[PDB]
Design a protein around this motif. Structure first.
Motif, mmCIF file in Angstrom:
data_model
loop_
_atom_site.group_PDB
_atom_site.id
_atom_site.type_symbol
_atom_site.label_atom_id
_atom_site.label_comp_id
_atom_site.label_asym_id
_atom_site.label_seq_id
_atom_site.Cartn_x
_atom_site.Cartn_y
_atom_site.Cartn_z
ATOM 1 N N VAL A 78 6.777 -8.507 -39.024
ATOM 2 C CA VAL A 78 7.040 -7.866 -37.728
ATOM 3 C C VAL A 78 6.264 -8.585 -36.642
ATOM 4 C CG1 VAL A 78 6.855 -5.678 -36.434
ATOM 5 C CG2 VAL A 78 7.543 -5.662 -38.820
ATOM 6 N N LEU A 79 4.992 -8.881 -36.920
ATOM 7 C CA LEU A 79 4.186 -9.619 -35.958
ATOM 8 C C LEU A 79 4.814 -10.962 -35.630
ATOM 9 C CD1 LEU A 79 1.470 -9.369 -34.379
ATOM 10 C CD2 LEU A 79 0.524 -10.911 -36.079
ATOM 11 N N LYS A 80 5.280 -11.699 -36.648
ATOM 12 C CA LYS A 80 5.899 -13.003 -36.347
ATOM 13 C C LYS A 80 7.091 -12.826 -35.426
ATOM 14 C CE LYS A 80 4.481 -15.127 -40.676
ATOM 15 N NZ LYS A 80 4.937 -15.809 -41.952
ATOM 16 N N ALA A 81 7.960 -11.855 -35.753
ATOM 17 C CA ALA A 81 9.147 -11.626 -34.914
ATOM 18 C C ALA A 81 8.746 -11.293 -33.497
ATOM 19 C CB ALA A 81 9.983 -10.452 -35.506
ATOM 20 N N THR A 82 7.727 -10.415 -33.321
ATOM 21 C CA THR A 82 7.353 -10.099 -31.947
ATOM 22 C C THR A 82 6.744 -11.312 -31.262
ATOM 23 O OG1 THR A 82 5.298 -9.097 -32.706
ATOM 24 C CG2 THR A 82 7.105 -7.619 -32.241
ATOM 25 N N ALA A 83 5.926 -12.123 -31.976
ATOM 26 C CA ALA A 83 5.358 -13.319 -31.330
ATOM 27 C C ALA A 83 6.445 -14.299 -30.916
ATOM 28 C CB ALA A 83 4.374 -13.990 -32.278
ATOM 29 N N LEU A 84 7.572 -14.311 -31.637
ATOM 30 C CA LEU A 84 8.711 -15.140 -31.209
ATOM 31 C C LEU A 84 9.510 -14.486 -30.103
ATOM 32 C CD1 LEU A 84 9.828 -16.324 -34.727
ATOM 33 C CD2 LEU A 84 8.864 -17.771 -32.957
ATOM 34 N N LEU A 136 4.435 0.126 -43.914
ATOM 35 C CA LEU A 136 4.755 -0.806 -42.823
ATOM 36 C C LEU A 136 3.953 -0.506 -41.577
ATOM 37 C CD1 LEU A 136 8.552 -1.234 -43.210
ATOM 38 C CD2 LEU A 136 6.868 -3.094 -43.407
ATOM 39 N N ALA A 137 3.787 0.773 -41.213
ATOM 40 C CA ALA A 137 2.958 1.083 -40.070
ATOM 41 C C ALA A 137 1.534 0.564 -40.235
ATOM 42 C CB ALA A 137 2.956 2.621 -39.847
ATOM 43 N N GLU A 138 0.934 0.761 -41.410
ATOM 44 C CA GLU A 138 -0.408 0.252 -41.642
ATOM 45 C C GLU A 138 -0.437 -1.277 -41.534
ATOM 46 O OE1 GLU A 138 -4.271 -0.313 -41.897
ATOM 47 O OE2 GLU A 138 -3.301 1.585 -41.403
ATOM 48 N N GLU A 139 0.552 -1.956 -42.118
ATOM 49 C CA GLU A 139 0.559 -3.424 -42.055
ATOM 50 C C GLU A 139 0.747 -3.915 -40.628
ATOM 51 O OE1 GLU A 139 3.689 -4.548 -44.632
ATOM 52 O OE2 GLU A 139 2.521 -4.506 -46.482
ATOM 53 N N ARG A 163 9.754 -8.261 -44.274
ATOM 54 C CA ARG A 163 9.263 -7.668 -45.538
ATOM 55 C C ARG A 163 7.804 -7.284 -45.441
ATOM 56 N NH1 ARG A 163 13.951 -7.588 -45.708
ATOM 57 N NH2 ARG A 163 15.341 -8.544 -47.333
ATOM 58 N N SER A 164 7.223 -7.284 -44.255
ATOM 59 C CA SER A 164 5.847 -6.863 -44.087
ATOM 60 C C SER A 164 5.570 -6.641 -42.609
ATOM 61 C CB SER A 164 4.862 -7.907 -44.625
ATOM 62 O OG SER A 164 4.920 -9.087 -43.809
ATOM 63 N N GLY A 165 4.433 -5.999 -42.340
ATOM 64 C CA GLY A 165 3.919 -5.944 -40.990
ATOM 65 C C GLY A 165 3.628 -7.319 -40.406
ATOM 66 N N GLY A 166 3.163 -8.261 -41.227
ATOM 67 C CA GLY A 166 2.976 -9.598 -40.723
ATOM 68 C C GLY A 166 4.274 -10.223 -40.264
ATOM 69 N N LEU A 176 -5.947 -12.381 -41.278
ATOM 70 C CA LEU A 176 -4.516 -12.227 -40.976
ATOM 71 C C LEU A 176 -3.679 -13.081 -41.906
ATOM 72 C CD1 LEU A 176 -2.147 -11.208 -39.097
ATOM 73 C CD2 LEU A 176 -2.653 -13.243 -37.703
ATOM 74 N N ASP A 177 -2.782 -12.455 -42.692
ATOM 75 C CA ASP A 177 -1.874 -13.220 -43.531
ATOM 76 C C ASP A 177 -0.754 -13.752 -42.656
ATOM 77 O OD1 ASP A 177 -0.884 -14.280 -45.985
ATOM 78 O OD2 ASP A 177 0.577 -12.602 -46.106
ATOM 79 N N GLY A 178 -0.580 -15.070 -42.646
ATOM 80 C CA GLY A 178 0.306 -15.700 -41.669
ATOM 81 C C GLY A 178 -0.448 -16.364 -40.550
ATOM 82 N N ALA A 179 -1.788 -16.254 -40.495
ATOM 83 C CA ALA A 179 -2.546 -17.045 -39.534
ATOM 84 C C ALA A 179 -2.470 -18.517 -39.888
ATOM 85 C CB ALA A 179 -4.023 -16.635 -39.528
ATOM 86 N N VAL A 180 -2.268 -19.334 -38.856
ATOM 87 C CA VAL A 180 -2.227 -20.794 -39.010
ATOM 88 C C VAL A 180 -3.511 -21.306 -39.672
ATOM 89 C CG1 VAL A 180 -3.181 -21.080 -36.637
ATOM 90 C CG2 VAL A 180 -1.762 -22.910 -37.711
ATOM 91 N N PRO A 181 -3.443 -22.323 -40.521
ATOM 92 C CA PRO A 181 -4.686 -22.963 -41.003
ATOM 93 C C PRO A 181 -5.493 -23.571 -39.884
ATOM 94 C CG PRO A 181 -2.880 -23.521 -42.471
ATOM 95 C CD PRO A 181 -2.254 -22.801 -41.224
ATOM 96 N N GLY A 182 -6.811 -23.493 -40.005
ATOM 97 C CA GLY A 182 -7.658 -24.145 -39.016
ATOM 98 C C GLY A 182 -7.379 -25.640 -38.901
ATOM 99 N N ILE A 183 -7.152 -26.301 -40.041
ATOM 100 C CA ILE A 183 -6.925 -27.738 -40.022
ATOM 101 C C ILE A 183 -5.710 -28.111 -39.177
ATOM 102 C CG2 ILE A 183 -5.442 -27.942 -42.054
ATOM 103 C CD1 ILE A 183 -8.608 -30.068 -41.217
ATOM 104 N N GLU A 184 -4.741 -27.199 -39.023
ATOM 105 C CA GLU A 184 -3.555 -27.457 -38.189
ATOM 106 C C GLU A 184 -3.842 -27.291 -36.707
ATOM 107 O OE1 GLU A 184 -0.287 -28.276 -38.950
ATOM 108 O OE2 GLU A 184 -0.345 -28.155 -41.149
ATOM 109 N N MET A 185 -4.880 -26.546 -36.346
ATOM 110 C CA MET A 185 -5.281 -26.393 -34.942
ATOM 111 C C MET A 185 -6.393 -27.326 -34.505
ATOM 112 S SD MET A 185 -3.090 -24.212 -34.023
ATOM 113 C CE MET A 185 -3.654 -24.115 -32.344
ATOM 114 N N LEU A 186 -7.068 -27.970 -35.485
ATOM 115 C CA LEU A 186 -8.316 -28.661 -35.204
ATOM 116 C C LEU A 186 -8.167 -29.762 -34.180
ATOM 117 C CD1 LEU A 186 -11.230 -29.290 -35.916
ATOM 118 C CD2 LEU A 186 -10.349 -30.590 -37.902
ATOM 119 N N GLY A 187 -7.130 -30.618 -34.313
ATOM 120 C CA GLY A 187 -7.042 -31.747 -33.384
ATOM 121 C C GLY A 187 -6.827 -31.278 -31.952
ATOM 122 N N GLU A 188 -5.967 -30.268 -31.773
ATOM 123 C CA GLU A 188 -5.730 -29.761 -30.435
ATOM 124 C C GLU A 188 -6.994 -29.116 -29.858
ATOM 125 O OE1 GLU A 188 -2.390 -27.054 -28.074
ATOM 126 O OE2 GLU A 188 -2.364 -27.067 -30.246
#
Ligand SMILES: Cc1cc2c(cc1C)N(C(=O)CC(=O)O)c1c([nH]c(=O)[nH]c1=O)N2C[C@H](O)[C@H](O)[C@H](O)COP(=O)(O)O
Ligand SMILES: Cc1cc2c(cc1C)N(C(=O)CC(=O)O)c1c([nH]c(=O)[nH]c1=O)N2C[C@H](O)[C@H](O)[C@H](O)COP(=O)(O)O
Ligand SMILES: Cc1cc2c(cc1C)N(C(=O)CC(=O)O)c1c([nH]c(=O)[nH]c1=O)N2C[C@H](O)[C@H](O)[C@H](O)COP(=O)(O)O
Ligand SMILES: Cc1cc2c(cc1C)N(C(=O)CC(=O)O)c1c([nH]c(=O)[nH]c1=O)N2C[C@H](O)[C@H](O)[C@H](O)COP(=O)(O)O
Lengths: 333, 333, 333, 333
Positions: free
Chosen positions: D268-274, D304-307, D263-266, C233-245
């Protein structure tokens, strides 16, 4: 000109490099000069929508006078460095725009000549080794019709301006301190001035919250939260970063102005949303003066007025008081 | 020279590249070297105004001696790498400026010769595999008139200096450790030194709050909060980022010095506002020595003295104690 | 080679661009790939001083085996893309260094051949559309002597690797999946694997705290906190940022490994100070393999071992357990 | 095309510079335009693993219609500037993709022609000096089959677009406002519209939490949290920075959409997660239209649908509702 940045480019073309450096530079590494801009760029406004904008007004009342904008021209020494009409060109444009103009202790035209332009001007005081000369400048200013004494309190001596040192900058023979060396001012000096005049005394160069409180206790009518455009202590916090805390601490006991880095109407809006009564603008006014004299300053002030009106209305504010109630959010640049 | 950065340029011209790299470099990716500068650049001072500046003094008392500035010359090994007079040039300039000079265990002139320059010097100790040689250096230093033992505790071995590895750097034949290998020091070593001398023992290289507390409990007279100029653990926090927490934890139980990245009087002011008793300055002193020998170091110390006086007065501080009571604000660069 | 970055340069010279891109690239805009590095660069260690370093050891016990470093070679598919000896070269170097090697489901040499190298290897599982083939890979791996099943849970399908799309990258005819398509794995799949083997099951690709807790509840012996090197997933948090929690939430109920961006012994130290049991290292091992085959991987592992020992001792840590008790501070880069 | 950025490059080649600038530009210094992107880049998603992804669906129900993605085409005036088929090309591609299309008050093809394309469109209203013309546009839109009124509330007048001023940009003679000047809208205008139609009224341009609450109290069916793509108040906070606070304050009382910089499906994902119900996408749709007309917009929407599908599944989300329950973490870029 469609932004204040158009005028900096214009002024850099025309001025001699060492005079441009005197105008542009800061002290030391210029960390505080840069931080004044960074700090404003980090502030974002949360605008309001769907408010009545029938009669948007940018006017304020300050120190007993209506001003056309929440803005005054900052005290900048030796304006004949930038244009042959110097202070008179700027003061005429400020008068015609309804903006207060701050006459400097180190003006290159005498304060009585500049005051004769009209426009209800202010007078900026430096404390002098000879105290009596300082209180005489105050009485001269009052006799000439100045409406406020802007006591600059952040110059016990001038900061280390490395551009000026590297340039070996000195005043041309044709530029003098026409009102005629520093002594450190103290709170005792403030009281001596307060006792010598009924005009409001405005302390310029306050950054600590405790000093803003003490200014109110000392009977100041206003303060300017300011690091002197990054020209005094290098590493001093930007005024805009202290402004909200200072506005809360004085809790309406005096006017709280801010300066440093104001370069658009949107920046004026940010300062007011952080609680400023008004801003001072320094370098951009000198860019306009260098570029095109009185007409240049007129064009700058008309552009700033348009930008302030635009920003206020886009943010849902029919008055400067409403703009002070806007909220802000810090962002990342 | 109008800033310390003028001297780095001067030293880069004259020194051989591999000696400049020995001086400039850090360990690993040089993350801690860069962070020492970033951390200072993020600190802004909140200056005070309108205070009495009749008799601004930059002097401090430390380890029983008056010093002219809240500054000492850091221990830097092998100073004949930078100039033929090496340590004697630096120690003479420090003496004449009233600044303590730290004589190194790895000095390229013997500690007795450097101590004979005068100026009440300090002595920096490395613990040696042969313990008895370490305690003998301590007694030599004390016999020669050194006034403090700066025990460097962050070098169980030397860090990985990749510039030196890439250069295949080695000491020229004409540079030696004139006082004549590392063993890791422990708290037992600290106690052995404390028992061997009545001089104050200063532990250099402390970054953890618990280690600063333990240093006080161990009878240290001071600590230097330091990551060894980014030359030891790459990724070690800057001392300036730990300083405020450490000053609060020791709560006056010893002197707390800091080093790493001090490059102006304004930086000295920041360190003191964060609570330092004094700073050490390393690389800039060697730049001045490389550029112009004893006179170069004299010019650097005069420039730093002027910058410290300027910054203190612009911030409303008539004494270093007042500067320690200044507040700071972190900003964005 | 004096840093891992020397090897990236070496590998970029020799590999075909599209194979270098397959190795280096991430998904989407490569935001998570870059953030893996940014996140480590922001972590600073607070080292301890004056501890006994008589017998510094970098060894750990994990999944019933002593390992020479708190590190294993990450699962990287298709290693014959980088060198003709592929997985066998890497596994031999890992064995000789005492480092676990993770045999991939998509290895370009069969898992039984790689396991025959020795070195007590691990096996990385992808869940397949045909479930029975997945459980058969598990039993093959166990029969061949693999000591842990690293179940990769972040690949319901492969991410969008735009470099590969732009290159039209495909496997050369001479590279195949030698153990022989994805089905999404679920918690039911985890239980099927746990019931099929007595080996520890390690879930690789966990980032949410709740998923780490559930992994412990599901009987996992370990997790790898990971965003798959920024390739999923592009935009997934780095593992190192979740590790302590995550380390706090599982509170010793399983081993917690981390990967993504480890490029030095200092980075290993940071990961352990944030609470990792061990790290995985992916791209640098392939750089070394590309550059110089088995000997290249040997040199990389010797360099990493030296950097880990150096960083641990400079931080006052005689054991990996002590390094896990170090504190950290976030900084600004 | 493998990313939305491929299409910006394609559109910059074909369009006249001043039309590209009309499309790309923002107001003032373009601080809010840049901040829309910075703000998204700072958001990282914490994906979930091991969930059932048998039937991943990107569909949502909004304003009484199923939409194929949590996305609609933003209102962008004068689309014949970008391609001769203008709005009809975009509306046809949106219809075929199952995405709502917002017909503009300033459309360059009449709203009845665009509505005849089908696809259940929305209609964006500007309030006009002549109020009756505004309510007539609303009734026209409803009569033509539009399914929601998107009342843009952040344009009491147009912002200061300095690129357009510097270009002296004006509409070509061949582009007109085919439905045929601004008056500031107020809450009274909102009520007049709500009383004139049974369609859901969606207020676009809300950034303050209090205004989002008041929108719900006023009977809005939705809001778009938006700074108008950085084209109105320069220095207005990005919508994405206000979205989470606004979603909490309205607590399901209306749909909460967001736009600016998607500017990407990712993204869109961020916006929905917020917490967004859906996003609007503006400039990328016009890039695709400029580059390749209807087919270009079709390709963009398929990409965009694929992303969006890819990002949702990689994050463990079988539905948009699950994506709204994802957590996020701010990072540093
Ligand atoms: C640019 C410039 C500013 C100043 C001066 C000259 C120049 C060329 N003056 C001096 O040089 C004094 C000296 O020679 O000792 C001067 C002064 N402030 C003051 O009280 N009296 C002064 O006489 N200032 C600061 C100013 O009023 C604003 O604080 C700052 O300009 C807001 O920042 P901006 O420029 O970003 O809008
Ligand atoms: C630049 C430089 C610094 C140091 C050294 C040499 C050089 C060329 N010395 C060694 O190389 C020791 C070795 O060879 O093992 C050395 C040393 N510290 C110490 O206790 N004994 C030393 O003998 N330091 C660190 C110093 O004292 C300051 O901590 C740092 O310089 C403050 O940072 P700045 O430079 O930014 O002001
Ligand atoms: C660089 C690279 C990494 C990976 C792969 C190939 C390459 C070229 N593999 C695949 O491409 C899988 C596929 O083709 O679907 C692969 C894989 N993880 C895994 O469980 N099985 C794999 O088979 N990873 C991630 C890895 O194990 C680490 O998580 C990451 O490398 C740590 O980050 P660093 O590289 O910064 O140290
Ligand atoms: C790029 C562009 C945007 C807009 C417009 C034209 C262009 C070229 N329109 C106008 O110029 C109005 C005018 O001329 O006064 C317009 C408008 N919003 C609206 O309600 N009615 C409009 O008629 N917007 C903002 C838009 O709907 C999105 O808010 C933004 O595009 C999301 O940001 P992104 O572009 O990063 O996805």
């Amino acid at each position: 000109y469609v932004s204040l940045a158009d005028l900096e480019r214009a002024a850099r073309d025309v001025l001699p490099g060492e005079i441009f450096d005197f105008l542009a530079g800061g002290s030391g590494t210029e960390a505080s000069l840069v931080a004044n801009r960074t700090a404003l760029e980090r502030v974002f406004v949360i605008p309001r929508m769907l408010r009545d904008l029938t009669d948007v007004t940018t006017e304020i009342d300050i120190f007993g006078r209506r001003a056309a904008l929440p803005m005054a021209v900052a005290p900048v020494a030796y304006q004949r460095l930038f244009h042959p009409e110097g202070e008179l060109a700027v003061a005429r444009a400020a008068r015609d725009a309804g903006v207060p103009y701050t006459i400097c202790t180190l003006s290159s035209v005498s304060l009585e000549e500049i005051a004769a332009v009209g426009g209800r001007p202010w007078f900026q005081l430096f404390w002098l080794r000879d105290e009596k000369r300082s209180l005489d400048l105050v009485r001269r200013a009052e006799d000439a019709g100045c409406e406020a004494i802007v006591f600059t309190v952040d110059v016990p001596w001038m900061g280390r301006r490395l551009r000026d040192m590297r340039n070996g900058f000195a005043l041309p023979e044709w530029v003098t301190a026409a009102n005629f060396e520093f002594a450190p001012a103290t709170w005792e000096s403030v009281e001596a001035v307060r006792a010598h005049t009924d005009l409001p005394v405005v302390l310029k160069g306050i950054l600590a919250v405790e000093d803003a409180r003490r200014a109110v206790d000392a009977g100041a009518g206003g303060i300017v939260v300011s690091n002197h455009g990054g020209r005094q202590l290098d590493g001093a916090v930007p005024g805009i970063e202290m402004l909200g805390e200072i506005v809360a601490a004085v809790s309406g006991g005096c006017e709280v102005l801010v300066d440093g880095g104001i370069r658009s109407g949107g920046d004026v809006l940010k300062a007011t949303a952080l609680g400023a009564s008004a801003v001072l603008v320094g370098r951009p006014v000198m860019w306009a003066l260098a570029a095109a004299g009185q007409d240049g300053v007129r064009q700058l002030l008309e552009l700033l007025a348009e930008e302030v009106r635009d920003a206020m209305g886009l943010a849902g504010c029919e008055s400067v008081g409403a703009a002070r109630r806007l909220n802000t959010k810090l962002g990342v640049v």
